[PDB]
Protein backbone atom coordinates (compact mmCIF):
# COMPACT_ATOMS: atom_id res chain seq x y z
CA UNK A 1 0.00 0.00 0.00
CA UNK A 2 1.81 3.06 -1.29
CA UNK A 3 1.52 6.85 -0.46
CA UNK A 4 1.55 10.43 -0.39
CA UNK A 5 1.08 13.73 1.30
CA UNK A 6 -2.28 15.56 -0.03
CA UNK A 7 -1.64 17.77 -2.30
CA UNK A 8 -3.47 21.28 -2.85
CA UNK A 9 -2.69 22.55 -6.04
CA UNK A 10 -4.64 22.33 -9.71
CA UNK A 11 -3.01 19.24 -11.89
CA UNK A 12 -4.39 18.14 -15.03
CA UNK A 13 -6.33 15.17 -15.17
CA UNK A 14 -6.38 12.11 -17.91
CA UNK A 15 -9.35 11.42 -19.44
CA UNK A 16 -8.99 7.89 -20.77
CA UNK A 17 -6.69 5.11 -20.65
CA UNK A 18 -7.98 3.89 -24.25
CA UNK A 19 -6.91 7.30 -26.35
CA UNK A 20 -3.11 7.88 -25.35
CA UNK A 21 -1.43 4.88 -26.23
CA UNK A 22 2.58 4.83 -26.49
CA UNK A 23 3.67 8.20 -27.17
CA UNK A 24 2.43 10.52 -24.88
CA UNK A 25 3.88 13.52 -23.22
CA UNK A 26 3.68 15.01 -19.44
CA UNK A 27 3.21 18.24 -18.94
CA UNK A 28 4.36 20.26 -15.82
CA UNK A 29 0.81 21.26 -15.18
CA UNK A 30 1.04 22.32 -11.50
CA UNK A 31 -0.46 24.96 -10.45
CA UNK A 32 -2.13 26.55 -7.15
CA UNK A 33 -5.88 26.76 -6.68
CA UNK A 34 -4.60 30.03 -4.50
CA UNK A 35 -4.74 33.04 -7.23
CA UNK A 36 -4.27 36.14 -7.25
CA UNK A 37 -5.48 38.74 -10.08
CA UNK A 38 -3.43 41.20 -11.13
CA UNK A 39 -4.17 43.30 -14.47
CA UNK A 40 -1.85 43.75 -17.08
CA UNK A 41 -1.25 47.56 -16.16
CA UNK A 42 0.35 46.78 -12.64
CA UNK A 43 1.90 43.32 -13.51
CA UNK A 44 3.18 44.65 -16.84
CA UNK A 45 2.93 48.18 -17.65
CA UNK A 46 3.76 50.71 -15.57
CA UNK A 47 2.89 49.39 -12.22
CA UNK A 48 6.42 48.06 -11.55
CA UNK A 49 9.30 50.23 -10.60
CA UNK A 50 11.76 47.90 -12.43
CA UNK A 51 10.02 47.12 -15.54
CA UNK A 52 11.55 50.06 -17.86
CA UNK A 53 8.28 50.65 -20.18
CA UNK A 54 6.61 53.31 -21.60
CA UNK A 55 5.06 55.53 -18.40
CA UNK A 56 7.49 53.75 -16.41
CA UNK A 57 10.22 56.57 -17.55
CA UNK A 58 11.68 56.40 -14.29
CA UNK A 59 13.10 52.81 -13.89
CA UNK A 60 16.15 53.25 -16.94
CA UNK A 61 17.47 56.34 -15.98
CA UNK A 62 17.60 55.22 -11.98
CA UNK A 63 18.69 51.58 -13.21
CA UNK A 64 21.62 53.27 -15.16
CA UNK A 65 22.63 56.06 -12.97
CA UNK A 66 22.44 54.12 -9.79
CA UNK A 67 24.13 51.02 -10.60
CA UNK A 68 26.61 52.35 -13.05
CA UNK A 69 27.33 55.80 -13.28
CA UNK A 70 26.91 57.06 -9.36
CA UNK A 71 28.41 53.79 -8.02
CA UNK A 72 31.14 53.45 -5.84
CA UNK A 73 31.69 49.52 -7.01
CA UNK A 74 32.48 50.57 -10.44
CA UNK A 75 36.76 50.04 -11.09
CA UNK A 76 36.73 54.24 -12.50
CA UNK A 77 35.19 54.84 -9.15
CA UNK A 78 37.70 52.73 -7.43
CA UNK A 79 40.95 53.66 -8.93
CA UNK A 80 40.69 57.37 -7.91
CA UNK A 81 40.68 56.30 -4.37
CA UNK A 82 43.11 53.83 -3.73
CA UNK A 83 46.23 55.70 -2.62
CA UNK A 84 46.55 56.05 1.41
CA UNK A 85 43.71 57.53 3.91
CA UNK A 86 41.16 57.25 1.00
CA UNK A 87 38.36 54.17 1.17
CA UNK A 88 39.51 51.21 -0.69
CA UNK A 89 43.42 51.27 0.31
CA UNK A 90 42.59 48.04 1.71
CA UNK A 91 41.76 46.35 -1.91
CA UNK A 92 45.48 45.89 -2.88
CA UNK A 93 45.85 43.78 0.21
CA UNK A 94 42.60 41.54 0.22
CA UNK A 95 43.31 38.91 -2.60
CA UNK A 96 40.75 40.36 -5.31
CA UNK A 97 40.86 42.65 -7.86
CA UNK A 98 38.60 45.70 -9.40
CA UNK A 99 36.38 42.90 -11.43
CA UNK A 100 36.16 40.73 -8.60
CA UNK A 101 34.40 43.55 -6.25
CA UNK A 102 32.41 44.57 -8.80
CA UNK A 103 31.04 41.26 -9.82
CA UNK A 104 30.95 40.80 -6.15
CA UNK A 105 28.82 43.73 -5.12
CA UNK A 106 26.04 43.15 -8.11
CA UNK A 107 25.13 39.56 -8.51
CA UNK A 108 23.33 37.39 -5.67
CA UNK A 109 23.77 35.77 -3.03
CA UNK A 110 23.64 32.59 -5.11
CA UNK A 111 25.71 33.63 -8.42
CA UNK A 112 28.33 34.55 -6.33
CA UNK A 113 28.23 31.54 -4.52
CA UNK A 114 28.65 29.67 -7.66
CA UNK A 115 31.68 31.57 -8.61
CA UNK A 116 33.03 30.83 -5.69
CA UNK A 117 32.45 26.75 -6.39
CA UNK A 118 35.09 27.35 -9.30
CA UNK A 119 37.82 28.69 -7.07
CA UNK A 120 40.86 26.39 -6.25
CA UNK A 121 41.84 27.28 -2.31
CA UNK A 122 45.53 28.05 -2.08
CA UNK A 123 46.47 29.76 1.21
CA UNK A 124 45.91 26.43 2.60
CA UNK A 125 48.08 25.04 1.21
CA UNK A 126 50.57 27.78 1.94
CA UNK A 127 50.74 26.34 5.50
CA UNK A 128 51.80 22.81 3.83
CA UNK A 129 54.85 23.90 2.43
CA UNK A 130 56.17 27.03 3.25
CA UNK A 131 56.16 25.81 7.01
CA UNK A 132 60.01 26.21 7.71
CA UNK A 133 61.54 28.76 10.65
CA UNK A 134 64.02 30.00 7.75
CA UNK A 135 60.90 30.49 5.30
CA UNK A 136 59.56 33.39 8.26
CA UNK A 137 55.73 32.48 7.73
CA UNK A 138 55.85 33.51 3.88
CA UNK A 139 51.98 35.51 2.41
CA UNK A 140 51.72 37.00 -1.00
CA UNK A 141 51.66 40.28 -0.69
CA UNK A 142 48.41 40.90 -2.84
CA UNK A 143 46.99 38.61 0.05
CA UNK A 144 48.29 39.82 2.77
CA UNK A 145 45.33 40.51 5.01
CA UNK A 146 43.22 37.29 4.51
CA UNK A 147 44.96 35.84 7.95
CA UNK A 148 42.34 34.00 9.05
CA UNK A 149 42.42 32.16 5.37
CA UNK A 150 46.28 31.23 5.80
CA UNK A 151 46.64 30.38 9.56
CA UNK A 152 43.94 27.24 9.50
CA UNK A 153 44.26 24.21 11.60
CA UNK A 154 42.20 22.39 9.39
CA UNK A 155 44.82 22.23 6.51
CA UNK A 156 47.60 21.03 8.54
CA UNK A 157 44.93 18.64 10.03
CA UNK A 158 44.25 17.01 6.58
CA UNK A 159 47.59 16.35 6.14
CA UNK A 160 49.01 14.22 9.14
CA UNK A 161 49.78 10.60 9.37
CA UNK A 162 47.09 9.39 11.88
CA UNK A 163 43.86 10.95 11.80
CA UNK A 164 43.66 11.88 15.45
CA UNK A 165 42.50 15.63 14.62
CA UNK A 166 40.30 14.30 11.69
CA UNK A 167 38.59 12.42 13.79
CA UNK A 168 37.56 15.03 15.90
CA UNK A 169 36.92 17.99 13.34
CA UNK A 170 34.08 16.59 12.41
CA UNK A 171 32.98 13.84 14.71
CA UNK A 172 29.39 15.43 14.56
CA UNK A 173 29.03 13.12 11.18
CA UNK A 174 30.52 10.40 12.90
CA UNK A 175 27.89 10.51 15.72
CA UNK A 176 24.71 10.99 13.22
CA UNK A 177 26.26 8.32 11.21
CA UNK A 178 26.45 5.62 13.96
CA UNK A 179 23.55 6.36 15.36
CA UNK A 180 21.37 4.87 12.34
CA UNK A 181 19.42 8.42 11.69
CA UNK A 182 20.00 7.64 8.29
CA UNK A 183 18.15 4.33 7.81
CA UNK A 184 15.66 4.97 10.53
CA UNK A 185 12.31 4.88 8.77
CA UNK A 186 11.01 8.94 8.20
CA UNK A 187 7.84 9.07 11.17
CA UNK A 188 6.71 12.33 10.21
CA UNK A 189 5.55 14.31 7.17
CA UNK A 190 3.73 17.29 6.39
CA UNK A 191 0.07 17.08 5.73
CA UNK A 192 -0.05 18.96 2.54
CA UNK A 193 1.99 20.25 0.19
CA UNK A 194 1.42 23.20 -2.21
CA UNK A 195 2.93 24.74 -5.58
CA UNK A 196 3.91 28.14 -4.80
CA UNK A 197 1.31 31.15 -5.78
CA UNK A 198 1.41 32.49 -8.96
CA UNK A 199 -0.14 35.83 -10.92
CA UNK A 200 -2.95 35.48 -13.05
CA UNK A 201 -2.23 37.77 -15.45
CA UNK A 202 -3.32 37.92 -19.19
CA UNK A 203 -0.11 38.93 -21.17
CA UNK A 204 2.34 37.69 -22.87
CA UNK A 205 5.24 39.30 -20.70
CA UNK A 206 3.57 37.86 -17.38
CA UNK A 207 4.61 34.16 -18.73
CA UNK A 208 7.67 35.04 -19.92
CA UNK A 209 8.86 36.83 -16.52
CA UNK A 210 6.87 33.51 -14.55
CA UNK A 211 9.07 30.97 -16.57
CA UNK A 212 12.15 33.26 -16.37
CA UNK A 213 12.44 33.94 -12.54
CA UNK A 214 9.82 30.97 -11.08
CA UNK A 215 12.26 28.49 -13.00
CA UNK A 216 15.18 30.56 -14.38
CA UNK A 217 17.51 28.07 -16.09
CA UNK A 218 20.70 29.67 -14.92
CA UNK A 219 20.37 28.72 -11.50
CA UNK A 220 18.69 25.46 -12.62
CA UNK A 221 22.15 25.05 -14.51
CA UNK A 222 24.35 25.99 -11.99
CA UNK A 223 22.05 23.31 -9.67
CA UNK A 224 21.63 20.34 -11.43
CA UNK A 225 25.30 20.40 -13.44
CA UNK A 226 26.16 20.46 -16.78
CA UNK A 227 24.90 18.47 -19.82
CA UNK A 228 25.84 15.09 -21.22
CA UNK A 229 26.95 17.56 -24.35
CA UNK A 230 28.46 19.68 -22.80
CA UNK A 231 30.70 16.88 -21.30
CA UNK A 232 31.39 15.53 -24.68
CA UNK A 233 32.45 18.43 -26.17
CA UNK A 234 34.75 19.28 -22.98
CA UNK A 235 36.18 15.64 -22.36
CA UNK A 236 36.80 15.28 -26.56
CA UNK A 237 38.51 18.51 -27.24
CA UNK A 238 42.14 19.18 -27.70
CA UNK A 239 42.66 21.35 -24.75
CA UNK A 240 40.75 21.54 -21.59
CA UNK A 241 38.11 23.84 -20.76
CA UNK A 242 35.97 24.91 -17.88
CA UNK A 243 32.34 24.23 -17.01
CA UNK A 244 30.01 27.28 -15.61
CA UNK A 245 28.77 24.14 -13.03
CA UNK A 246 32.46 22.56 -12.19
CA UNK A 247 30.31 19.82 -10.51
CA UNK A 248 26.77 19.24 -9.40
CA UNK A 249 26.40 21.99 -6.49
CA UNK A 250 23.15 19.68 -5.38
CA UNK A 251 23.97 19.19 -1.79
CA UNK A 252 24.11 15.69 -0.83
CA UNK A 253 20.69 14.43 1.01
CA UNK A 254 21.18 13.36 4.24
CA UNK A 255 18.90 10.61 4.57
CA UNK A 256 19.15 8.24 2.60
CA UNK A 257 15.88 6.41 1.74
CA UNK A 258 14.08 9.23 1.53
CA UNK A 259 15.18 12.44 -0.42
CA UNK A 260 13.84 15.57 -1.32
CA UNK A 261 10.76 13.89 -1.62
CA UNK A 262 7.80 13.15 0.78
CA UNK A 263 6.50 10.15 -0.99
CA UNK A 264 6.35 6.70 1.29
CA UNK A 265 6.91 3.47 -0.20
CA UNK A 266 5.78 0.61 1.82
CA UNK A 267 8.07 -2.17 3.35
CA UNK B 1 19.87 50.64 -23.11
CA UNK B 2 16.59 49.33 -21.41
CA UNK B 3 14.35 47.48 -23.62
CA UNK B 4 10.68 46.28 -23.69
CA UNK B 5 9.01 43.59 -25.68
CA UNK B 6 5.93 45.09 -25.98
CA UNK B 7 3.95 42.51 -28.42
CA UNK B 8 4.22 41.16 -31.44
CA UNK B 9 3.29 43.08 -34.93
CA UNK B 10 -0.52 42.92 -36.28
CA UNK B 11 0.90 42.39 -39.37
CA UNK B 12 1.78 38.78 -38.68
CA UNK B 13 -1.29 38.19 -36.45
CA UNK B 14 -2.76 35.40 -38.39
CA UNK B 15 0.46 33.90 -39.58
CA UNK B 16 -0.70 30.71 -37.39
CA UNK B 17 -4.37 30.95 -35.99
CA UNK B 18 -3.94 30.40 -32.20
CA UNK B 19 -0.69 31.48 -31.45
CA UNK B 20 -1.05 32.97 -27.38
CA UNK B 21 0.62 36.60 -27.94
CA UNK B 22 -0.20 40.33 -27.56
CA UNK B 23 -1.36 41.71 -30.97
CA UNK B 24 -0.42 45.38 -30.68
CA UNK B 25 -0.41 47.94 -33.92
CA UNK B 26 2.07 49.35 -35.31
CA UNK B 27 2.72 53.01 -33.48
CA UNK B 28 1.61 55.48 -35.60
CA UNK B 29 4.22 58.20 -34.61
CA UNK B 30 8.20 58.73 -35.38
CA UNK B 31 10.47 55.92 -34.66
CA UNK B 32 13.14 58.25 -33.30
CA UNK B 33 11.21 60.39 -30.25
CA UNK B 34 13.23 62.97 -28.69
CA UNK B 35 12.26 64.09 -25.17
CA UNK B 36 13.82 65.49 -21.85
CA UNK B 37 13.42 64.76 -18.38
CA UNK B 38 14.42 66.41 -15.56
CA UNK B 39 14.29 63.92 -12.54
CA UNK B 40 15.32 64.04 -8.71
CA UNK B 41 17.22 61.50 -6.91
CA UNK B 42 17.63 61.31 -2.73
CA UNK B 43 21.32 60.41 -1.71
CA UNK B 44 19.46 57.53 0.33
CA UNK B 45 18.40 56.04 -2.48
CA UNK B 46 22.32 56.29 -3.48
CA UNK B 47 23.46 54.91 -0.10
CA UNK B 48 20.96 51.61 -0.34
CA UNK B 49 21.74 51.20 -3.86
CA UNK B 50 25.62 51.33 -3.00
CA UNK B 51 25.01 49.02 -0.27
CA UNK B 52 23.21 46.04 -1.61
CA UNK B 53 21.75 44.97 -5.19
CA UNK B 54 18.42 46.81 -5.16
CA UNK B 55 15.71 45.45 -7.59
CA UNK B 56 17.60 44.32 -10.90
CA UNK B 57 19.40 41.14 -10.43
CA UNK B 58 18.33 39.83 -6.38
CA UNK B 59 16.52 36.68 -7.47
CA UNK B 60 17.34 34.93 -4.34
CA UNK B 61 15.57 37.47 -2.59
CA UNK B 62 12.02 35.08 -3.25
CA UNK B 63 12.70 33.00 -0.34
CA UNK B 64 11.73 35.70 1.73
CA UNK B 65 13.14 34.87 5.18
CA UNK B 66 16.92 35.66 5.51
CA UNK C 1 36.25 -0.17 -25.26
CA UNK C 2 34.96 1.98 -23.59
CA UNK C 3 34.53 5.83 -24.62
CA UNK C 4 35.73 8.27 -22.13
CA UNK C 5 36.14 5.82 -19.17
CA UNK C 6 40.06 6.00 -17.94
CA UNK C 7 40.89 2.45 -16.24
CA UNK C 8 42.74 1.97 -12.80
CA UNK C 9 43.54 -1.85 -11.88
CA UNK C 10 45.60 -3.09 -8.89
CA UNK C 11 46.62 -6.28 -8.41
CA UNK C 12 49.32 -8.27 -6.49
CA UNK C 13 52.12 -7.69 -9.26
CA UNK C 14 51.44 -4.10 -9.52
CA UNK C 15 48.77 -1.26 -10.86
CA UNK C 16 48.52 -0.41 -14.04
CA UNK C 17 46.15 2.48 -16.02
CA UNK C 18 44.65 1.35 -18.85
CA UNK C 19 43.39 4.38 -21.31
CA UNK C 20 40.70 4.00 -24.87
CA UNK C 21 42.35 4.57 -27.77
CA UNK C 22 40.13 7.48 -28.38
CA UNK C 23 41.44 9.57 -26.00
CA UNK C 24 45.19 9.78 -27.19
CA UNK C 25 44.15 12.52 -29.66
CA UNK C 26 42.48 14.64 -26.92
CA UNK C 27 44.00 16.65 -23.89
CA UNK C 28 43.40 13.75 -21.70
CA UNK C 29 46.52 12.01 -23.18
CA UNK C 30 48.94 14.86 -22.13
CA UNK C 31 49.39 13.38 -18.38
CA UNK C 32 49.85 9.79 -20.39
CA UNK C 33 52.30 11.03 -23.38
CA UNK C 34 50.51 11.38 -26.29
CA UNK C 35 48.70 14.98 -26.42
CA UNK C 36 47.17 16.45 -29.17
CA UNK D 1 8.87 37.67 -71.35
CA UNK D 2 5.56 37.81 -69.72
CA UNK D 3 7.04 35.53 -66.70
CA UNK D 4 7.84 39.18 -64.51
CA UNK D 5 4.33 38.16 -62.87
CA UNK D 6 5.73 37.89 -58.81
CA UNK D 7 3.71 35.57 -56.32
CA UNK D 8 4.15 36.74 -52.27
CA UNK D 9 4.67 35.27 -49.04
CA UNK D 10 3.68 36.87 -46.26
CA UNK D 11 0.58 36.10 -43.45
CA UNK D 12 -2.56 37.00 -45.28
CA UNK D 13 -5.51 38.49 -43.16
CA UNK D 14 -8.37 37.01 -43.88
CA UNK D 15 -11.86 37.82 -44.11
CA UNK D 16 -15.24 37.24 -44.62
CA UNK D 17 -16.20 35.74 -47.69
CA UNK D 18 -20.56 35.60 -47.50
CA UNK D 19 -20.18 39.39 -46.17
CA UNK D 20 -16.97 41.73 -46.38
CA UNK D 21 -16.28 41.96 -42.71
CA UNK D 22 -13.04 40.51 -41.23
CA UNK D 23 -14.06 36.54 -39.75
CA UNK D 24 -11.42 34.81 -37.98
CA UNK D 25 -12.97 31.12 -38.70
CA UNK D 26 -13.79 29.05 -41.08
CA UNK D 27 -16.15 25.51 -40.83
CA UNK D 28 -15.57 22.12 -41.56
CA UNK D 29 -18.66 20.50 -43.73
CA UNK D 30 -18.06 23.77 -46.64
CA UNK D 31 -14.80 25.90 -45.40
CA UNK D 32 -16.14 29.14 -45.62
CA UNK D 33 -14.83 31.98 -43.53
CA UNK D 34 -18.14 33.58 -41.44
CA UNK D 35 -18.25 36.92 -38.98
CA UNK D 36 -21.13 35.36 -36.79
CA UNK D 37 -23.86 33.14 -35.95
CA UNK D 38 -26.49 34.97 -38.07
CA UNK D 39 -24.15 34.15 -41.40
CA UNK D 40 -23.18 30.61 -39.86
CA UNK D 41 -27.03 30.11 -39.82
CA UNK D 42 -27.51 31.19 -43.65
CA UNK D 43 -24.64 29.05 -44.52
CA UNK D 44 -25.94 26.11 -42.78
CA UNK D 45 -29.25 26.43 -44.21
CA UNK D 46 -28.00 27.12 -47.62
CA UNK D 47 -29.63 25.67 -50.94
CA UNK D 48 -26.88 23.17 -52.54
CA UNK D 49 -24.69 24.33 -55.65
CA UNK D 50 -23.97 27.80 -54.17
CA UNK D 51 -21.48 27.08 -51.14
CA UNK D 52 -19.17 25.95 -53.58
CA UNK D 53 -19.98 29.40 -55.68
CA UNK D 54 -19.03 31.25 -52.51
CA UNK D 55 -15.07 29.37 -53.17
CA UNK D 56 -15.78 29.69 -56.99
CA UNK D 57 -15.58 33.44 -56.21
CA UNK D 58 -12.61 33.60 -53.73
CA UNK D 59 -10.51 31.28 -55.48
Known sequence: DTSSPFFCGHFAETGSFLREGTNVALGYSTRSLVEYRLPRLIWCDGGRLDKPGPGNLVAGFRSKYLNHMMNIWTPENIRSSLEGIENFTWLRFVDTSLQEAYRASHTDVFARAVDLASKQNRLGHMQIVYDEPEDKKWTPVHALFQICERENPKAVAEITTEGVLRDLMNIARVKYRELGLCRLEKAARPRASAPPIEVVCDSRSAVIERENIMFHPAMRKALFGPTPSEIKEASFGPRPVTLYPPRALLPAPDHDKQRFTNITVPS | ?66 | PDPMMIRWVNNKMGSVVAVPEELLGTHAGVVFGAGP | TNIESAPSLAPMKHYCDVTGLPAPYLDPKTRLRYHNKEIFAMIRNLPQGMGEQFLEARG
Do not use: W
Open chain 2, 1 to 66: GACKRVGRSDAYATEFDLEAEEYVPIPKGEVHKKKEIVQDVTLHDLDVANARPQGGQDIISMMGQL
